[PDB]
Structure formats: structure tokens, C-alpha cells
Amino acid sequence: GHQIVHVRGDSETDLEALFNAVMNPKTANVPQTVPMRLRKLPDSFFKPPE
């Protein structure tokens, strides 16, 4: 079993980017996308099972 991990140089920066996209969207400069709620997805996708 060999675990070779490939990491790109700005991982921790991107991690912050993942957050301040939400915490201050304006000073973010992050790619923009359609929220999953507004996509053609099954109703289950947002109601967890019982």
C-alpha cells in the first residue's frame, strides 16, 4: 500500500479562499457558480433520509 499525496503550492491559501468567499464575498475574487439548491437535482439531495 503506497500513499503518494500530490499537493499544489497554494493549498492553505485556497483553504482561506474557500472561507472568505462566504465571509466577505466582495473582497474574495473567487470563481462564481450556480448554488446546488437552484440546480435540477432531486428533492432528496437537500432533505436527508430518516
Add this chain to the structure above:
Amino acid sequence: SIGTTKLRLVEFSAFLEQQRDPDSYNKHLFVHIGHLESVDIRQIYDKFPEKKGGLKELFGKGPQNAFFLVKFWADLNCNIQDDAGAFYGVTSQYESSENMTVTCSTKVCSFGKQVVEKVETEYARFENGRFVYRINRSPMCEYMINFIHKLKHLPEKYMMNSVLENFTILLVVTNRDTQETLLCMACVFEVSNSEHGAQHHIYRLVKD
């Protein structure tokens, strides 16, 4: 019935172990499988990397019935002890009827780019008359561990869910010798608010 006859994912588990002292052991599961509706794969193409060996390139490269979308409600309700060494790991078990060299690639993707790719090579083990490939206590990347910590300190879960909007994991298991896609599992996450525990919906990916 997750996976094809070529290779069947029967077990998946990401966890935190904690050793407060020599008499104390704790284990917390974040998500777990193994303890169907369909989704148009084009709807989730704007959430995964679709470049060389991308969820799109692989779809046509191998069997479409090997592709799956999993929505996880992760269980983040775990008291991280500050005085205890902690192992963050991922145990996944795959069972197959044939003996092949198996390579599992786990990629954490932010927006359209995969930040970290981990490649694990596994070999067939004969158990109960079948060949079983199992990754035992594989360590998660510092990125994932930091991500969990950064999520925790968010005050509300709706904030957690919002950052998870742009977070995905692509899991691709492949026959190393033939480069045939054995199983591909695209992963999307919210944070489970259920008291009982982590929940998960599995969908088969299709095109139209």
C-alpha cells in the same frame, strides 16, 4: 449495491481517533457508507474538474454505470480533545470477483480545481472466496484536517454549509494495469444536523 462486478465499494469511513490517556480511546465517524435515484451528470459538471482524466473525460472513457454521486451529511459533532493525540484517517473497502491491480485516487476539489490528489495502490486479497481490496487507516491530508478545524470554529451550521458549496471530493478507483475505470464516486457535502448521526444519499450518474 454500490459499484459494478468489476469492483464494488462495500465500506467507506472517515474518522477521528483520540487517545486522551492510556485508559481512554475515542473514535468519531464523520461520514460512513456500508454500516437508487439518478442525476444528470451535466448538472454537476460545474462542481468538479473536467480536464485530463476529469469526471467528464472518464464518463465516456469507461462504463457509465461505474459513476456515482454521493451527497453526504457529515457528522461534525465531535469534541476534539486538546490534550490528546488524534489520528484523522479514512478506511475504505472494495470487494471484486476478479484479481486486478487497483489504484484509488482521492482528490479534494475547491471550485473547479482539485487542491490535493492522494493516490493509493491496493492488491487483491482472497477472503470468503472473493478478492477484497481494502485501504486500512489511510491518513487524511493536512488540508482536510485544517478544513475540519476551520469549519468547526464557524458559529452556525448554515455558514458551514455555505463554504461547503464550493467543496467537492472526487474518488476514482482504477485498474492500474488496464487504466480501466472501476468505480468513480463524486462527493458533495453538507453538515448533518441529525442527532442520530451522519446521513448519505447515493445517486447514479447518467447523461441524456
